[PDB]
Protein: Mitochondrial chaperone BCS1
Amino acid sequence: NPYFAAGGGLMILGTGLAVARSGIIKAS
Amino acid sequence: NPYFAAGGGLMILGTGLAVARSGIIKAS
Structure:
């Protein structure tokens, strides 16, 4: 469990990267 | 966590590879 509790964090930060890549485009 | 902190780095460098493959085409 704790060794693979990092996959969820990587998914979270990847969704954050996708949200930021969407937001930068939606501003310019 | 630290053993699987490399998946995020591989995703980062893969996004960089995709960005470079897009940029080389968008120049020529």
Notes: The two ends of chain A are 42 Å apart (CA to CA). The interface with chain B takes residues 2-7, 9-10, 13-14, 17 of chain A (CB under 8 Å). Residues 15 and 21 of chain A are 10 Å apart (CA to CA).
